[PDB]
Amino acid sequence: AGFDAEQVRDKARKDLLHLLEGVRGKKNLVIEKDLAGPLGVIVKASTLRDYGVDNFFFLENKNTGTSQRNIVFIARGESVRNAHAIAAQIKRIQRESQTSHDFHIFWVPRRTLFSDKVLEEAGVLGDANISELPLYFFPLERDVLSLELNDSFRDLYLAKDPTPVFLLSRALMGIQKKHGLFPRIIGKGENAKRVADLLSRMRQELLAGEEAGESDRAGLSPSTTIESVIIIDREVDFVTPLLTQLTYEGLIDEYFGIQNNQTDVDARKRKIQLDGSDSLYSQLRDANFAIVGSLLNTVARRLKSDYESRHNTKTTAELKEFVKKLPGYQAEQQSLKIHSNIAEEIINYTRTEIFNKLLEVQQNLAAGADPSSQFDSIEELVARDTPLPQVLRLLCLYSCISGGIKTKELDHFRRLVLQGYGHQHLLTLHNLERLQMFLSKSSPLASMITMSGSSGGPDQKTNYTYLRKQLRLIVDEVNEQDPNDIAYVYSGYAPLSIRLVQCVLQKQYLLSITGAQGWKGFEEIVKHARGPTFDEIQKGEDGDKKTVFVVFVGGITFTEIAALRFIAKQEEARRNIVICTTSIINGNRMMNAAIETATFE
């Protein structure tokens, strides 16, 4: 009866295939490249051709095939960058065709007034069959839902585009319609509050619809399946993704780049699948890289010792047994060979001087050391031409964790970057200033929160000096082999974001390391983190273990996913934890939101 991530995949596959049946005949496929990956999670390429697709084309490639009469456009309908591209795709074969063509566009997830005008002000609105493809969450795992919006971070925090918040809101409301109102909407931060607002608005619009004869049959009552949804704004805690991640999946995302559960290695290069259907990867992904050697050894000598199993046997039937367990002994065999190779590459990566000089800085900054003491180490890294994203993450780390950079050190930093990597990065440093990730200490927007200096400033920033102690962000006495606490994901540093979540879910454990819902017990402490703290109760108007949705507006890291799975195992008795997010984020994606790539050459 509860929430199952499978119902989202099956529904997604259904709604697409149902639209493909609708296009009678054979098709060519034009898919937005950022959307091709996420589609792969809900349908197979094989399956798409059964339903009559010839070749696959990208909207970004402009080279749409002429072979077929029906051309199918699949792209996100909120994107302005897509509408202009599609209309221009229609006439770019409407004038160099052969037949006349019937054009079809599946908008993800909805048809917008913006679409209907850009398509009209190109003359091609009436020549295109337009339908709506309501994909929202892409279930990447049974406990991980994602909107998969790759520019969601940039758009939300740089462009101030509230589109990510709107989509996220409709997705969560879809869960409510099916499984009941969230008995409690619990959150932290501006955009977390905005989502809670739209959920409140959308709940009232459904009661206004039913009351005013729009029918819709059945009014929404509090869920019996769901305990609460917890919403955290990414901007409340920029430090976690800025840090180099130290889990196995985490280091894969840092070094190789994970996308839509898949990555690339060199045995052009080959694709690896990275989901939890693989037995071995499930036990590996959330584990600190330090003990990945141990974990690989143990499973390697447990494979050859289960090949020692029952091939002695011989009747005729208990070998027919053993032989059927042999595919999985080949799946488990090669699963090991792949990850023993990745681990070997990632190990070499983690041994380089530059890697260690970066981590050294992070570790000092994250521990509360005088940020100034790290200046020479940063200066050298710049002079040793270490990749701009890696340096900028340190710069933002220092800024965000200290309440900004001292004015002298700022100007020095500005000079190094500009002189190190290009004067184009005036723009880059400006963008990081807009992001409020890299600021002078004398700026009003730099100040952390204190109860001391009460007034002055409304957007006061998270106090990492205060919360380091009060939320026990440092645990340098943590077992990586059998982890006792979430800090293991950084080998001594627990993400503030998940600590914040622990203020709601594990109140007693949190006291332990220094039974009401909401923030009760941590009101003061959480006041020291950026933005609104709230606990909106939904009673409507009219038991077993329940599901908890932990939602990240603005992106979540794998380390945070790991720490949440860790808590989920602990709470296995009373709670099923599902993670929702706009996208899976990391330090590099954040800097790319900022880095200007034009070049003066």
């Binding site: 509230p162 500009l418 004067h423 005036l426």
Partner: protein
Amino acid sequence: AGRQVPLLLSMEEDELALDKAIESGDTDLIYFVIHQLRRKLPLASFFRVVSSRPTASAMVEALARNSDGDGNEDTALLKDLYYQDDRRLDGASVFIREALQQPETRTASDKLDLAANLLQGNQKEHVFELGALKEAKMLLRMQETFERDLTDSFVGLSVNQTMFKLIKLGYHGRAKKIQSEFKVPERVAWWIRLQALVAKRDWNEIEEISRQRKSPIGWEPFFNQVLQAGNPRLAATFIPKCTNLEPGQTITMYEKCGMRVKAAEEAVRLKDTEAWNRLLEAAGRNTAEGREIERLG
């Protein structure tokens, strides 16, 4: 609340319709109202309406930098919007951006000039960017000089990258000109100087560098950098210039250079009989003389 917005606008309630669309969060309704306002109003009046509301300006601003599918801009819109709001940094960034698309340095510097010209309309607070802009124009110019004189690519590289290329090509006189001009830090410049000479295989002047007393970055960098893909012979020469070192590492450094002999010698000099044993057993009392290792005690 979803087409309760045009209701507000049907009665030509412009600024009010926009506010209700913003409260909705529905980015579609916001575009729709923004689109209505633009067609209806004097542009300057449109800007005033749209600049009072943060989300509105933000979306207006987005559409201006993405109106065919990436790439192309409505740069004209951006300039006027920023001009009527006295947003001078944002206006300057538009011109800087234009400089990065100019195919010749003279035009690129003109855009930088336009860029700078806006910032002197408030001078203070903009000191850094003015200086930064002033620098790039200089660097571009010096790089155009280098290209004609020395016949190689230089225009567009960073200050540091330029020093590197000048040094790797043996033009240390010019590379020192860049350094002095842009006040490149000592520790930065030494790091550059070393890495380039190593790329250059100019073992001769790396050697000539070693002939002075102290280094602002130490000699530890010179060891490792030269050792790696280079001469263990040249590498070894940087011990014992190394001030900042840990006990009995001079030994391992001679070892890493493949000089077990001189390692043994260094081992005996430090009164470490144990390392001397390990070094002699490595050879073996007879092999590689070893006697020579043995004669050293």
